[PDB]
Design a protein around this ligand. Structure first.
Ligand SMILES: Nc1nc2c(ncn2[C@@H]2O[C@H](COP(=O)(O)OP(=O)(O)OP(=O)(O)O)[C@@H](O)[C@H]2O)c(=O)[nH]1
Ligand SMILES: Nc1nc2c(ncn2[C@@H]2O[C@H](COP(=O)(O)OP(=O)(O)O)[C@@H](O)[C@H]2O)c(=O)[nH]1
Ligand SMILES: [Mg+2]
Lengths: 431, 431, 155
């Protein structure tokens, strides 16, 4: 196999990673103590093995404050991870990109690399890293951008994928979150090969609409996010022919290195209270992949053009029914590919139904689908973020907090200007 | 970000500071001897923020008591909680200040400032991870104004990376008709704009108007005024003392409330307004708490928010209530009063909910606002300062202690520049 | 020069020294470098007994300094109610104007001396008197939001 190391930065990256690794164990059949009964490899990309038969995740948890990681050190899966891979500081970045990148982040950046090096030396064929972090947090933005620069120097030919959390005012914690999201994007744009953005507002509205959760919490959001991250990384952990390694993620989803932000859509999402629902067909869940309500980022792909589209099915799915669903969707919907790409749809099928976590809000389904697509409509997400950035930066609001922590004010302009060039990268492709 | 060192200086500082410890000790379930008598684990979650753990099950406040007059030392020990304060933390000089800002800042207080710093270092080094300092004082007197600002400068140059917070009491002729108080207040504000991170303006003019016109108290006393202060200080520190989100620490609060370094003077609000032992307010709901929190009659500073524009707003709700209802009411006021919020700071309103309400109440709401309307307080003190300074009245009291006459002019020029800075962003548009 | 000693004696409130200096021919209407008379300093520092004995010995109750300040201006500013009633009893100009356009009513309204405001109004203080910036005593109450001062000026 080719191993994969997952990196979890900040509160958002740690709590989402905790929910993901709980789901990974229930999918592979791994007990919370790391023991897996005589199962019959592919799962070894995410799990190493000790001499006693213990399956330990290839994961690193980093945070500048210990409150969130201390929950993992005492939680249900506390005996699953290596204790030395749970790294904690004492004072967080205070929602300041400059603290996580320049001042506070430097005091622990070397220790994180030496711990990552220990997992790297254990691998026989390391292919890349998975980085989980938020955009708004000082650690998720400042420390992540710092870590991505170091990984490009010490690991030259290794891939790097991101699971980034897009800020949403419903469940946001800082007014300077638009600042940090722009600063971390400009500094990580050249060091990241493919980034899957998760809009908190999209996941928030899905929980209220489909799951009937009046006021969703971080628990409700993370369980749904982990259910989507699993469908994206299932091809790396199980047998298949589509997106079998990190290099294939770039080949299938990213035609040009700067536009490496694919859009993810998931279906079906059904509340657990409706255990006796009707099993939606392959054609029903495929048509739901083109509705804006099921997308992980709030945007309208009908207003953009397609450069790539992948379909990862899970469960009772007959391949002949997928082709009939694509032929109908090709002629029914207004799906416009760019003039320089083949209008084909890549299909991968895993014949196991998705695994639900006990205590979750999702019901069991016989078939589910996750579509990964690269459409120019995702530039709308950058446009809303750039508008909040320009409103505050015109008056230089909150800027003194950043320049007081080693950062220079000129970095604000070079980052915003890079976003303007990134916005025109989508316009030059699909007008 | 955990422990906070408390410091109280002067007559007003020790009076409002003693009431602060009496109120929060009843909320955490601490008797006058220091033994925990509560019945909730949340009372001991964040108790290390304001208390030090003694030998037994005793919690000692992290408070430092300073004053030039020895008389107030006897008044603190006469209080119900005078024995829980550390006898090592009592620093009292020989002669008072005599309502002279120069005696506390240059002569009498400059000799006593070294003995306090030794207590600050002894208290700060015993903290596992010091967060900052909070100071309670008045600005119209001599010690809390003169030595209070001197102690801030001496402590800040030794702890520059920490947070300096102040609860400053503004003078008013309605309560104390001492004509040299506009002198001491203006000289203090000249220091607060440079040496503090967060300053809560507790205006005696507003406290008097609330007791006289709303509470129907024809002869308001300091006990009636401090009842509003202690209730406000307990509310603004709710999330520093309980398992909370929103800010949770002083720096994250400062990043989300201070858009410009000089504009760090907050307008406290509170609702409902009850007398001492009256227990009158009862049928108070969520829509009414949100209404009164943004009303001029519930502001602890004599400033009408309708006259200016909000830069940042933080609200802390206390009691058993609906998170969905609090969110619907906060969004409604932001839409109803959208003309009173600046449009170039998106999502400038932070909302908080705490399940533990204060003593004698089930519903409570504390308002922390950074409004441009606070200039009406600074223009009121400046007008009284200019009326006195243009006649050179009692100027020999200050020059006789070593002050130069230019210190009054440069202090008069700073607050006028501060008022022009509030009016600057009050008229600014996003365009 | 007994004029300089009478100035300092009126400041420190030495009643015995003021009576003796006047007995030796001291100028009751002497002025300092800024034009302050012994009646100015006695009314500023709240020495009522010295204000009384000065007015009975040829003191000019309406004297002005370099900046046009009368004894009534400084008494209304510092807030000496008993001195204000004594000065008005000896013919002090209730509507005297200094170099800033301020009247005794302006200074009492600004400093919050509410009882002195009522006394000045009862003695004929001009409510329409504007300062150098057009503000009257009623304008200062509105701009500062002083409702008790506003109602006093409305009678
Ligand atoms: N979906 C999801 N989002 C989260 C979670 N925790 C935090 N966030 C988001 O992350 C953003 C803030 O970043 P954080 O991760 O909390 O901050 P941090 O990475 O710990 O960095 P610091 O500023 O130093 O605390 C907010 O917009 C939150 O909405 C979580 O558990 N799940
Ligand atoms: N709200 C309130 N204000 C006070 C109290 N005591 C004094 N003050 C105010 O503080 C000012 C006097 O300053 P003070 O603190 O007594 O002088 P210091 O001892 O040199 O600090 C006056 O304007 C009072 O209005 C009090 O208990 N409560
Ligand atoms: Mg953090």
């Amino acid at each position: 196999m080719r191993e994969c190391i997952s990196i979890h930065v900040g509160q958002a990256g740690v709590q989402i990673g905790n929910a993901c690794w709980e789901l990974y164990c229930l999918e592979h059949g791994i007990q919370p103590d790391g023991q897996m009964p005589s199962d019959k490899d592919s799962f070894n990309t995410f799990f190493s093995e000790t001499g006693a038969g213990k399956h330990v995740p290839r994961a690193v948890f980093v945070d500048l404050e210990p409150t969130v990681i201390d929950e993992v050190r005492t939680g249900t899966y506390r005996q699953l991870f290596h204790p030395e891979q749970l790294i904690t500081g004492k004072e967080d970045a205070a929602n300041n990109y400059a603290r996580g990148h320049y001042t506070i982040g430097k005091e622990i950046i070397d220790l994180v690399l030496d711990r990552i090096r220990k997992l790297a030396d254990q691998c026989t064929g390391l292919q890349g890293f998975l980085v989980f972090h938020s955009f708004g947090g000082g650690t998720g933005s400042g420390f992540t951008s710092l870590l991505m620069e170091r990984l490009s120097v010490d690991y030259g030919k290794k891939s790097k994928l991101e699971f980034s959390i897009y800020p949403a005012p419903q469940v946001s914690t800082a007014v300077v979150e638009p600042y940090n999201s722009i600063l971390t994007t400009h500094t990580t744009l050249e060091h990241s090969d493919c980034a899957f953005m998760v809009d908190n507002e999209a996941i928030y509205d899905i929980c209220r609409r489909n799951l009937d959760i009046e006021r969703p919490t971080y628990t409700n959001l993370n369980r749904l996010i982990s259910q989507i991250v699993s469908s994206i990384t299932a091809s790396l952990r199980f047998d298949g022919a589509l997106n079998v390694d990190l290099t294939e993620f770039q080949t299938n989803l990213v035609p040009y290195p700067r536009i490496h932000f694919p859009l993810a859509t998931y279906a079906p999402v059904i509340s657990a209270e409706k255990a006796y629902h009707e099993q939606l067909s392959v054609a029903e869940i495929t048509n739901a992949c083109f509705e804006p309500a099921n997308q992980m980022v709030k945007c309208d792909p009908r207003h953009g053009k397609y450069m790539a589209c992948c379909l990862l099915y899970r469960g009772d799915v007959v391949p002949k029914d997928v082709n009939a669903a694509i032929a109908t969707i090709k002629t029914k919907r207004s799906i416009q590919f760019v003039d320089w790409c083949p209008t084909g749809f890549k299909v991968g099928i895993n014949y196991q139904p998705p695994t639900v976590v006990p205590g979750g809000d999702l019901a069991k389904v016989q078939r589910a689908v996750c579509m990964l697509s690269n459409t120019t409509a995702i530039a709308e997400a950058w446009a809303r973020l750039d508008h909040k950035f320009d409103l505050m930066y015109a008056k230089r609001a909150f800027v003194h907090w950043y320049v007081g922590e080693g950062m220079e004010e000129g970095e604000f302009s070079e980052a915003r200007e890079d976003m303007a060039a990134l916005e025109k990268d989508y316009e030059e492709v699909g007008v | 970000m955990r422990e906070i060192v408390h410091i109280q200086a002067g007559q007003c500082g020790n009076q409002i500071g003693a009431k602060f410890w009496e109120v929060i000790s009843d909320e955490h379930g601490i008797d006058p001897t220091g033994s925990y008598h509560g019945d909730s684990d949340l009372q001991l979650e964040r108790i290390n923020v304001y208390y030090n753990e003694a030998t037994g099950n005793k919690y000692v406040p992290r408070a430092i008591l300073v004053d030039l007059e020895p008389g107030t030392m006897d008044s603190v020990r006469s209080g119900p909680f005078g024995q829980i304060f550390r006898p090592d933390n009592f620093v009292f000089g020989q002669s008072g200040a005599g309502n002279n800002w120069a005696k506390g800042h240059y002569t009498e207080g400059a000799e006593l400032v070294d003995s306090v710093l030794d207590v600050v270092r002894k208290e700060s080094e015993s903290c596992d991870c010091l967060q900052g300092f909070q100071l309670t004082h008045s600005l119209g007197g001599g010690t809390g104004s003169g030595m209070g600002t001197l102690l801030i400068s001496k402590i800040r140059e030794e702890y520059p990376d920490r947070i300096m917070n102040t609860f400053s009491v503004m003078p008013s002729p309605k309560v104390s008709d001492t004509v040299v108080e506009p002198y001491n207040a203006t000289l203090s504000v000249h220091q607060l704009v440079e040496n503090t991170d967060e300053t809560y303006c507790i205006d005696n003019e507003a406290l008097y108007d609330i007791c006289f016109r709303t509470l129907k108290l024809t002869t308001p006393t300091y006990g009636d005024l401090n009842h509003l202060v202690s209730a406000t200080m307990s509310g603004v520190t709710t999330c520093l003392r309980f398992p909370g989100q929103l800010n949770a620490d002083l720096r994250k609060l400062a990043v989300n409330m201070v858009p410009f370094p000089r504009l760090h003077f907050f307008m406290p609000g509170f609702a409902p307004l009850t007398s001492r032992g009256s227990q009158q307010y009862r049928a108070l709901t969520v829509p009414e708490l949100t209404q009164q929190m943004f009303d001029s009659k519930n502001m602890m500073a004599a400033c009408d928010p309708r006259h200016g524009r909000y830069l940042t707003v933080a609200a802390i709700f206390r009691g058993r209530m609906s998170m969905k209802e609090v969110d619907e009411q906060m969004l409604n006021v932001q839409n109803k009063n959208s003309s009173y919020f600046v449009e170039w700071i998106p999502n400038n309103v932070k909302t908080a909910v705490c399940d533990i309400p204060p003593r004698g109440l089930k519903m409570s709401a504390t308002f922390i606002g950074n409004s441009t309307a606070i200039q009406e307080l600074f223009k009121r003190i400046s007008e009284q300062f200019t009326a006195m300074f243009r006649r050179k009245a009692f100027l020999h009291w200050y020059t006789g202690e070593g002050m130069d006459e230019m210190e009054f002019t440069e202090a008069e020029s700073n607050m006028n520049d501060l008022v022009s800075e509030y009016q600057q962003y009050q008229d600014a548009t996003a365009d | 020069d007994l004029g300089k000693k009478l100035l300092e004696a009126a400041r420190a409130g030495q009643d015995d020294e003021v009576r003796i200096l006047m007995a030796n021919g001291a100028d009751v209407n002497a002025t300092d470098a800024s034009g302050l008379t012994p009646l100015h300093l006695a009314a500023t520092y709240g020495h009522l007994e010295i204000v009384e004995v000065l007015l009975k010995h040829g003191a000019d109750v309406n004297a002005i300094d370099i900046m046009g300040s009368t004894p009534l201006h400084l008494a209304a500013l510092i807030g000496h109610l008993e001195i204000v009633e004594v000065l008005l009893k000896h013919g002090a100009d209730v509507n005297a104007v200094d170099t800033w356009g301020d009247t005794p009513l302006h200074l009492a309204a600004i400093m919050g001396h509410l009882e002195i405001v009522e006394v000045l109004l009862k003695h004929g203080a001009d409510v329409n008197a504007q300062d150098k910036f057009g503000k009257t005593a009623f304008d200062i109450s509105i701009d500062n939001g002083n409702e008790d001062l506003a109602e006093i000026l409305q009678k």
